[PDB]
Design a protein around this ligand. Structure first.
Ligand SMILES: C[C@H](CS)C(=O)N1CCCCC[C@@H]1C(=O)O
Ligand SMILES: [Zn+2]
Ligand SMILES: [Zn+2]
Length: 227
């Protein structure tokens, strides 16, 4: 299943969907995996999240060229931390249009990230304002509320059973939500449940720091945020 391509790993999840995985030695935590997505929509490719670094992100684009060989129309990144936004400059160097929550772009400089070119804004109910996500094809973008960070967003893939929780969701047997340094501890639990309710038919939950899991990942995350 897994395909090793340099120091990255790619796994097909559905006919038009792949998970990209990249690793960063975080002193004190080991070599930490981070997952994002690659989606083919007809004659173009859409990317969810960068890798940790520009070099790794360029390797994602090289893998796309080899395995899909269609242009990358856009990328959307799911919050202003390095695992999701660390490779922005590589996307820009490649000419790819980039999108993030407006709040992620606001936070990017202080978090050490390069901002995306375009800002997404969200309705009161959490769904992206459609004019801010033009030409997103099957990507359905949802702001569940503050949790892992104030800016975290999530993405469903229409035509599949897949929803991507990014760093908000941990798998059903995880033991910790992380260090919570940037987390909204008051609202985290509600935000996790809101993600599940926004994508109620998704049976494959993809997330940044666990392999894909069933919907049990959402309720386990939500219970731990209760603490
Ligand atoms: C870099 C990354 C951005 S989500 C990060 O800070 N993490 C996630 C990796 C391992 C856990 C530590 C910390 C956390 O979530 O507590
Ligand atoms: Zn994060
Ligand atoms: Zn993360």
């Amino acid at each position: 299943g897994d395909q090793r391509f340099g120091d990255l790993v790619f796994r097909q999840l559905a006919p038009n969907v792949w998970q990209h995985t990249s690793y960063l030695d975080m002193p004190g935590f080991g070599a930490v995996a981070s997952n994002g997505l690659i989606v083919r929509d007809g004659g173009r490719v859409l990317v969810v999240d960068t890798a940790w670094t520009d070099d790794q992100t360029a390797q994602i684009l090289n893998w796309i060229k080899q395995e899909i060989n269609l242009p990358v129309a856009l990328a959307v990144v799911t919050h202003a931390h390095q695992d999701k936004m660390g490779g922005m400059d590589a996307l820009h160097a490649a000419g790819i249009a980039t999108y993030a929550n407006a709040l992620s772009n606001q936070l990017a400089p202080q978090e050490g990230m390069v901002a995306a070119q375009h800002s997404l804004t969200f309705a009161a109910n959490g769904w992206v304002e459609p004019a801010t996500a033009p030409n997103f094809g099957p990507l359905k973008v949802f702001y569940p509320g503050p949790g892992h960070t104030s800016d975290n967003i999530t993405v469903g893939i229409d035509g599949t059973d897949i929803a991507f929780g990014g760093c908000l969701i941990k798998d059903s047997k995880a033991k910790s939500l992380g260090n919570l340094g940037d987390a909204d501890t008051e609202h985290y639990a509600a935000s996790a449940r809101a993600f599940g309710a926004a994508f109620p038919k998704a049976s494959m939950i993809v997330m940044s720091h666990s392999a894909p899991d069933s919907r049990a990942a959402i309720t386990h995350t939500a219970r731990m945020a209760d603490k």
